[PDB]
Design a protein around this ligand. Sequence first.
Ligand SMILES: O=Cc1c[nH]c2ccccc12
Ligand SMILES: [Fe+3]
Ligand SMILES: [Fe+3]
Lengths: 111, 118
Amino acid sequence: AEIVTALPVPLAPAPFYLTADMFGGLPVQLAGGELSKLVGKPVAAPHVHEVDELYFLVSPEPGQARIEVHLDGVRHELVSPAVMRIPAGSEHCFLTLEATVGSYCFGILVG
Amino acid sequence: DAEIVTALPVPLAVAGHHQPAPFYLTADMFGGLPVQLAGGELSKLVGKPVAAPHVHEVDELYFLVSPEPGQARIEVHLDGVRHELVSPAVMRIPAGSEHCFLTLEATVGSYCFGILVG
Ligand SMILES: O=Cc1c[nH]c2ccccc12
Ligand SMILES: [Fe+3]
Ligand SMILES: [Fe+3]
């Protein structure tokens, strides 16, 4: 049985739960984390990937988490649940506006 | 102005499952994805299986996560053998294996996601 438990893995420094090398190779990588601890961050740093990224925002009940996604100088405000595609090349980040305990935003890099 | 999906989850039927499963990524989104991702919050699933044992022709990952390590536990049946997963954990289920899971323990904000890998 193939079980990975040494998780998340820091990668440059974001917490990964799926990496492209696991289990013989994956077509996605998946990072992210619990949002309630991030409601407090006042700033986020724009960045760009060479593959598409999907943001996946979820909370125990719909509507309990809220982020702003800054994409190429446009501010978007999303409420859980929500998925948003960030095209490769695009400058982006998000800030957490609101979150109950056990709200998550995951970033999924699509190979 | 990129693509946002908020009509979620998407209920799809999956073999052996009592009710439609809640999908957040499906294969046709955004021009086509190499994965599908379903699942959700476990705190009201404790003791209650979502499915009879089932088999897919694709690999499935279970991804189990909770606000703190150790707050969620599931039991995966994989071809008659029982495995306990403790958050955080990723388990690969090879295509053709008969399987399902039972939630053993979960706080509010514990999740299990099933990831079907093309
Ligand atoms: O992967 C299947 C799954 C995980 N959580 C739920 C919740 C409800 C139906 C199906 C499922
Ligand atoms: Fe990103
Ligand atoms: Fe399955």
